[PDB]
Amino acid sequence: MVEMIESQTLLLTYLTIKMQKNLFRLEEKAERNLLLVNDQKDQLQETIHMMK
Amino acid sequence: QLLIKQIRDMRSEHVALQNQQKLAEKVDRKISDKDENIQKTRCMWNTIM
């Protein structure tokens, strides 16, 4: 019984570490994409204001 | 999604404003004489009053 629980713990832990590593990579790519688009928004906003 | 919507709206606004500026520049060359005309008018009034 102790050997079975340990095997379960190993599976869960493996899944967890694998997911966390791949999630951090997505979050970083996402934030970068948002900042790039936000910067484009900011340039357009300044040009519109000057024209007005 | 929010950012996409905002950029689209701003682009539309920018085109509209560009059309309005092109109509206004056909009138402006002669501005180099404003401060001088105001002071001239003020001076004429001061003389009369």
Swiss-Prot record, chain A:
Localization annotation: Cytoplasm; Cytoplasm, Cytoskeleton, Microtubule organizing center, Centrosome; Cytoplasm, Cytoskeleton, Spindle; Cytoplasm, Cytoskeleton, Spindle pole
Family: Belongs to the HAUS8 family.
Phylogenetic placement of the source organism: Eukaryota, Metazoa, Chordata, Craniata, Vertebrata
Biological function: Contributes to mitotic spindle assembly, maintenance of centrosome integrity and completion of cytokinesis as part of the HAUS augmin-like complex.
Entry superkingdom: Eukaryota
Name of the protein: HAUS augmin-like complex subunit 8
Coiled coil: 25-52
Assembly mode: Component of the HAUS augmin-like complex. The complex interacts with the gamma-tubulin ring complex and this interaction is required for spindle assembly. Associates with microtubules. The interaction with microtubules is strong during mitosis, while it is weak or absent during interphase. It is unclear whether this interaction is direct or indirect.
